[PDB]
């Protein structure tokens, strides 16, 4: 079979993409180690058939792969006929991601969608790994599935309480015990913060951009899907902020908040995971940092939406992942405060109390400053709008 | 044999029950005409054998009956020795419900569990009526069953698909077709709404709390199991909200949502069903009402589970079942909406468009009001969490 | 706010702690609302540097904080240079508790230790709040202190006579009246009982597990230090009994005596204290109980140590703190004796006469029992060793 | 990991339904006398008296200052019994009678290699030291079941698959287990004998000098723990405890009621001491002799026995075995029927074996012409039998 | 002397 890493791509926000915009995304996906984009599309978008076409063409031109994620918040069980005709077009397309000789197909929800009639009407074999909510259902589904994709990327206990971290693998283990002789696609997400009038909460992630990958080496799922490449609206994008996507409102908390440096962390772990290593290998000294724009208690001045649910469980911290070939001393300035920790060789995340004002990072070995600089955003104690996304940046020696 | 009515009881949530807690539920089931509780227990609960012991003791003390429902979401075929030793304890307990001289036993799922080894190891005869997902396997079952219990209590196309109502008997007929001479335990459920990470949907029930009982008089299955007595998490409880049960998170949408009044509908139909009568007998003038707490299109922005699947197929209605000895006039006030219908004698369900605000109900005969009052709960257009449970109430002359 | 609660942690008994042991302790403190551990360490322990390093790392990993408590029962004024190099290691570690931007440092005694030389050699600012015996020295110390920590956690009148309680705030006033521009760290301690051949006495505490938090909301000090997290030797631990710690001989009176339930009282008072409320808020219905294992006059059978000084001033009582949302009746069975008392909503402590034998508690409201059970420990009228520690337990709804 | 070594003994809870606490006390006092630290309480989920007897056994332990731990017999317990396993551990992990290995509650199994201890440990407050019985050495080395060690059941000569090979016993399997138990704990098995005669199991392993040989191996190997198989498994003939009044006959009374094995504890005791003290030789206290032998030649034909002869018996020897425990060298003389043997024996603990003769058995130890101990075998060797019995009779004499 | 930073339940 081999191991593969996919990334969740929001087709709904790229109405105006060209083939070239797609190729730029997949090129940056390729150089992270990602094998394929899950193209998350909706029945209600007039641009779905066009943009699926562009994505598969782009995949073919840059030798990336793609598979379709039928987003069943929009698709319905009564859409079988359409879904079949789409699979007929793309299951045997050269750009279609193939898992064990079959066209991978997944979904967002759609636990009840029967893939049997789709599979029977398409010549080319299909490998159906829908997103399922219940591990028990994943182990006994009657819908002709070949594995399950868990959306449990963040700490949760089973209810609609926001719970503290850190992330545990409890839900992965429940899924895995039910999927014995089937495939498990584990989710990997750095972050979660959403601020729409139809959804306004955070999950408690913190060191999640690093720790989740550590869990992937322990657990070795058959597949990984990164949530997400470009879902700006829920703040878990690790892809670039593309000029051509259509803003859904999330520009407010994503436009000046690059997340690209998180691909610096994912890259060594994607390689280790595909190689079956238990520990990543650091090739050069780098540093990744992330922090929210304000302390969590800063009441904003203008926001037509309330503060997000769950923010009292966040910590006011600056997070720093160092990827070093030899041990060193990490020094962090956060506003008026300064901290220092010795940090070992390898990939290591530390958290520092967040202070209002300038952020500065330095890594020294013997007496040599090996890398360092100012964080790209000042922490503030005022805000117009509740922004619980994070700014991410990096230094590379 | 005779006909009996049973009710699904969650042992999993009564860890702290005393024998008296059981006896209270048992008395309320006895007043409804219920013959036995299905004790739905799991192997993974330390307290299963304790609460099974109290249950059987309580049954004998109040001349009530119980039988075990092994929940095979938790039990497995590896548990045969334990299941056999439990059957050896209780198959001839004085509280054990006996169906034509055999101890009734059932399950949740566990279609492939073989009762042969269990029956050949227990002296007392056992009557195995497991929950089977496949009507056809109910006819060719190699597992030494004496009947099948259907869990198709709600409108569905299979795979837990949600479809518009009303409830039909399509699945019941497949079971009775394939069972031939074996026993059929038909499910009766008033509602379905659940709001957890692993399950977040509604079935489209609506007038189901009445319409299913009418379907039972027409159908006359050998047995009936009410889903359920106390499954708060799925909103189909007809028993009281008990103070001793353990909250699984469902108190959020059930603490203030009594469903006791639905027993007013159940009681005369249970009697007609055991009598084999084709129509219920109304002894006194009564009215049962139910409705959801909000219009279906309300947005609950902080609820991290998001809205349940299926809600677009619901209607915003107030539902009213009248139990009338004589024709009369029903008037309902729903917010600013105003309705009046001539209701015939007997048991009749009417539904009316939902209006936000206070609800009011009145039955008049010869221009004299014979029962009425204000709905226990005001319908509202704002909400913290999605709740698609119903408030149920009644009025009696 | 700018108000924090700390707990006194015995570094001397955790030579074999791992970082993970420390994390478990800190997580349980974090759950209680405690902000930092006072790392009470000795110059003579070979493992002080290691275990200091562990604790600070663990604070970093679970985003807790720690500060060093130099135990001047062991440290001497001649240790200035070693204390300085330790403060240079940790004053700017992220795990280090910062108070108004300065590294908090404290001590056990050491009244005469001069902090000026330490402040002068350490670049990071330092906030020194040593334990001072004399309130007047707190008012006029020449040792460059920024506040004072009182050890007056129990009833005492200035001399070495043991006195009856209850606790008063007499010593708290004396300190505050000497610290009206510096910081007062007030002690909070639930109990006191020690039984070594170098210290063998009780203080008279009784209702102190609750009374002292009440005094804190009135006496609103700048900081609180809880005595203690894990000093089993003096029976004032509120932390778990950790198997990783090294028994000094106190296991004889602490192995079978959990104190964890006192954290149920602390948590609402810690919340109120930080939020400046003068009354705590009760979340759900709970009960905490505690009692000594024998009537105080029981002469025991093989104790190589005499009866502790002061035990004749104790009361043979069972103490119950009810945390309640509405009023209720509390009934207490102690041996062959049964008592009841009506109990208001809120947090209320009642004492009950001790009877030898088993102990039972139940809280009733509207006839229903809402919480109750048996105490984990039967009161005995014989014993091998003098044990004036208490057994603590709880019940929750 | 514990600075000290310990010896435990496998105890069948399944045969002691009618035990009282006092019956337990009696067994534990004789185990204490031997230097054994704890009983492994081998119990089954399907016994209605498991909780009654575990309770009695923990109380007895605390009352006589002995220790116990639970051996979950996974021929009956199943991986789906985590909840009950977990709750029994919460009852007993901190019981006064619970054996603690370096502060954690010891827990063991028979088989159950895939049972996951993680969920138990995580749900039990008091720490737990998981040393299950594992059949594969290689799997002891990278098990995913949260184990702190492995307990080997390779107590007898075998090529695996319960194959029967000639002895003498070697440590080939202990090495495999120790090689894969790098940092973790190895609990090695010590068994004197093996003969079982049931429908489901009817064979012998070739043990012979095993009741002594295996202890000598333990002083060279110094495993972190030892479990003696067994205290009272009468059914497999490896019991070293008394034949108790109160146990329930499972059918083994036929070959065990008149076959005391207590004298084997005389060999056990000094070797338990050298093992715990990390010493390479035992210390002999007084001159003693321990003898054992089967009741009949191995070619005896028992036509009435529907089980037929046990598998393996062709590799046995018709021998009488004698272990001498001498403070100074002496001469061993043995009479077996009309056979007559004498051999010089060094000081220390030495086993000799002599061809078996039908009839009266006799033993004598003399030093420079002077009798120091000896007497008649407790059982005449017979050449005709009703049922195949390949258990041994065991006796002793003391100077 | 070097630590693993933020880490999963297990190191130590
Ligand atoms: O009104 C703006 C926008 O509307 C149309 O475009 C929609 C497009 O914005 C986008 O909306 C998605 C949502 O569907 C939703 O996606 C969730 C996602 O957040 C997460 O839960 O994962 C699941 C599966 O991936 C998704 O269902 O929320 C995100 C923000 O967090 C929204 O951006 O996609 C939908 C459907 O594809 C589009 O209809 C309209 O075409 C466009 O012109 C306009 O800009
Ligand atoms: O032999 C036992 C133990 O000795 C060494 O470890 C010592 C360790 O037990 C512990 O001893 C403390 C005492 O120092 C003393 O602490 C008091 C405390 O009770 C209270 O008065 O407050 C002040 C400040 O907190 C402390 O001074 O008494 C407690 C019991 O109440 C003892 O546990 O810490 C000391 C010093 O750090 C250790 O030296 C030895 O290293 C260790 O291996 C051995 O187990
Ligand atoms: O999570 C907190 C809770 O966990 C443990 O108790 C469990 C208890 O909550 C309950 O769990 C139930 C689920 O098994 C499941 O029940 C299904 C029914 O919804 C439905 O009718 O269909 C089938 C068959 O009837 C059931 O499997 O979901 C419900 C909620 O809808 C949920 O209540 O029972 C289990 C197993 O018996 C308990 O283990 C824990 O023991 C408890 O202390 C804690 O409060
Ligand atoms: O398994 C749950 C489904 O049960 C019913 O669907 C049945 C089909 O799965 C199919 O099952 C056959 C089965 O009964 C058995 O006898 O062996 C056959 C060969 O392996 C199976 O193909 O056909 C049955 C007859 O049409 C169906 O009854 C429910 O209809 C479905 O909703 C459930 O998901
Ligand atoms: O029907 C509501 C219950 O759904 C979940 O339990 C499922 C079982 O009911 C059963 O689901 C059947 C399914 O296999 C399919 O083929 O069609 C039937 C009709 O829709 C379904 O009833 O089997 C599933 C797999 O084991 C179960 O997940 C919930 O767990 C349960 O609580 C609900 O009451
Ligand atoms: O070896 C004496 C025991 O045999 C039977 O129990 C077996 C287990 O001990 C174990 O057998 C191992 C087997 O898997 C093979 O791989 O070789 C090993 C060395 O010979 C064996 O020890 O597992 C078997 C399968 O579950 C068991 O049947 C008897 O039941 C037991 O009483 C004997 O003590
Ligand atoms: O055969 C009648 C007895 O059966 C039940 O007791 C069992 C015990 O005999 C005991 O069985 C051992 C068995 O598990 C295996 O290890 O072989 C041994 C012989 O070498 C057997 O002694 O343990 C079982 C499980 O713990 C018991 O279930 C009845 O309970 C008992 O009353 C009868 O005497
Ligand atoms: O409440 C209805 C749906 O709202 C949420 O999803 C929204 C999506 O449908 C679309 O309108 O975009 C917004 C954000 O731009 C999304 O929040 C729910 O999470 C979804 O499941 C509901 O069907
Ligand atoms: Na059929
Ligand atoms: Na055994």
Author numbering:
A (entry chain C), B (entry chain B), C (entry chain A): 35 to 431
D (entry chain D): 33 to 431
E (entry chain X): 6 to 17
Paste lines from the article.
Glycoside hydrolase family 71 (GH71) includes α-1,3-glucan degrading enzymes which could be exploited for biotechnological applications; however, the family is presently poorly understood. To increase our understanding of GH71, we have performed a phylogenetic analysis of the family and detailed biochemical analysis of two of the five GH71 enzymes encoded by Aspergillus nidulans (AnGH71B and -C). We present the first structure of a GH71 protein, AnGH71C, including structures with carbohydrate ligands. These structures revealed a conserved acidic dyad (DxxE), found to be crucial for activity, and active site water coordination consistent with a classical inverting GH mechanism.
Complexes of AnGH71C with glucose and nigerotriose/nigerotetraose were obtained by soaking crystals with ligand and clearly revealed the binding cleft within the N-terminal (β/α)8-barrel domain. The two protein molecules of the glucose-soaked crystals each contain two glucose molecules located in the same position in the binding cleft, while each of the four protein molecules of the nigerotetraose-soaked crystals contain distinct combinations of nigerotriose and nigerotetraose occupying different subsites within the cleft. Crystals of the apo protein and glucose-soaked crystals were of the C121 space group with similar unit cell dimensions and contained 2 molecules in the asymmetric unit, while the nigerotetraose soak was determined in P1 containing 4 molecules in the asymmetric unit. When overlaid and considered together, the annotation of the −4 to +3 subsites can be observed separated by two acidic residues (Asp265 and Glu268) found at the beginning of the loop between β8 and α8 of the (β/α)8-barrel domain. An additional nigerotriose molecule was also observed on the surface of the cleft in chain B extending from the +3 subsite and could be bound in +4, +5, and +6 subsites though the trisaccharide makes few direct interactions with the protein and its position on the surface of the cleft makes the subsite annotations questionable and could result from soaking ligand in high concentrations. Within different chains of the oligosaccharide-soaked crystal, both α- and β-anomers of nigerotetraose were observed occupying the -4 to -1 subsites. When the α-anomer is present, resembling the substrate configuration, a water molecule is positioned close to Asp265, 3.2 Å from the C1 atom of the sugar at the reducing end. This position is taken over by the hydroxyl of the β-anomer, the configuration of the inverted product. AnGH71C has an active site water molecule, proposed here to act as the catalytic nucleophile, positioned by the dyad’s aspartate in a small gap along the protein surface and in line with the C1 of α-anomer products. Only small protein structural changes are observed upon ligand binding in AnGH71C with the most significant being the packing of the loop between β6 and α6 over the substrate along the +1 to +3 sites leading to interactions with Gly193 and Asn194.
